[model samples]
Target: MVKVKFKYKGEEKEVDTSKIKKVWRAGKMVSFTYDDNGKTGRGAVSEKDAPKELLDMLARAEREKK
Candidate 1:
């Protein structure tokens, strides 16, 4: 039941850490995946090249490769 918090454009947001599968960056977008309570899907947000704080948060939140 752990929750993670991070800021984007000065606005804060939270996600359930246990459900997150991965986080990625593509051009100006940052994307992630979650369990969605046992559903298959994803979410994408614009970072406009990703500011430093957001970048740092993403680095910390990204999934570890196996």
Candidate 2:
């Protein structure tokens, strides 16, 4: 499972992987997921938008899943 932790606006929280739907990168929104927990609770982080060093972490998460 991919362990994910990030901040919502200014408050930080640890998110559950099953709660995530998918990663989205649209025109205006660099957002992912939908309100699985709330109305506006969307977007995690992606390799493209995340820190370069963190990309490997995400990749490992996926690999670990398999």
Candidate 3:
């Protein structure tokens, strides 16, 4: 498996996935960045159509990323 990493906000996050269908759907692999208290956090979701999980994580990551 290929590992992909990216910098978001001011931090680094990794995208992990095991679903080939997700990749086929171009749904897996996403990076998110946020800002808060002059700092930023990063998050990612490597799932297929993970709207709820992505939204939840993005929200928890930061309001800006949301």
Candidate 4:
């Protein structure tokens, strides 16, 4: 898992790659489950500022049909 900083709601947020439980991709926007201090929440970021590696990782972990 890779650790990186993402622009969450215009503020810098540290995102743990292994902590992403799920991810959704809609056009250029991406939303995913993120954990902070053991608490999880939904957060989204655009492809604009988000690093390509992180976006690629999100794609790799996109929610599977259930």
Candidate 5:
């Protein structure tokens, strides 16, 4: 699984590709979900705030979903 780190609400957070259930993108905006302590959690970030590795994973996931 790919590990990605970015800032959310001024706090640094990390997310793994394996944990992400889905991804949505619009322009530079990205939204995704993952299991957080046994509960589903959602997050959103701008492309500029996300790492290239994370964006790459999201691109691949979006492509394969088609």
Candidate 6:
């Protein structure tokens, strides 16, 4: 997945899935860092748990090489 978009905590968010370099999850939270070419970035959030698609993205990100 690349540049996937979705709503979390009622806010719209986008992630360059292809650029993900790191991923992690703890309890009900998930996070990932990515290389944006020009700058590095990271996303972190929680909600009891992530939605279905977000879960997929995080798992895939963890599976990918940073």
Q: Please list the C-alpha lDDT of all candidates, in the order they appear.
A: 0.62, 0.51, 0.42, 0.69, 0.75, 0.64
* Candidate 5 deviant stretches above 4 angstroms: 1-12
TM-score for each of the candidates = 0.48, 0.43, 0.29, 0.60, 0.65, 0.49
- RMSD per candidate (Å) reads 6.5, 6.9, 11.2, 2.8, 2.6, 4.9
lDDT of model 6, residue 17: 61
Name model 4 segments beyond 4 Å from true: 48-53, 60-63
Report how far residue 32 has shifted in candidate 3, in Å: 1.0
Specify the highest-TM-score model's number.
Answer: 5
* Regions more than 4 Å wrong, model 3: 1-27, 52-66
Candidate 1, clashing residue pairs? Answer: none
Which tens-of-lDDT digit does each residue in 1-66 have in candidate 6?
545454546777777666766667876667767675768766665734445656677778668875
Clash-forming residue pairs, model 6: none
Q: 4 or 6: which has the higher TM-score? A: 4
User: Regarding lDDT, does 2 or 6 come out ahead?
Assistant: 6
| Residue pairs with clashing backbones, model 4 | none
Stretches of candidate 1 above 4 Å error? 1-18, 48-57, 61-66
lDDT of 2 at 24: 39
Candidate 2: TM-score? Answer: 0.43
Compose the digit string of candidate 4's lDDT tens values, residues 6-44.
665678777766777677678887777867768886677
| lDDT tens digits, residue span 3-50, model 2 | 456666787665555555555344433345534556556555544445
Q: What is the TM-score of candidate 1?
A: 0.48
lDDT of 3 by residue, 1-66 (tens): 333354556776444322111111224555554343345544554554345544454445444422
lDDT for position 27 in model 5: 80
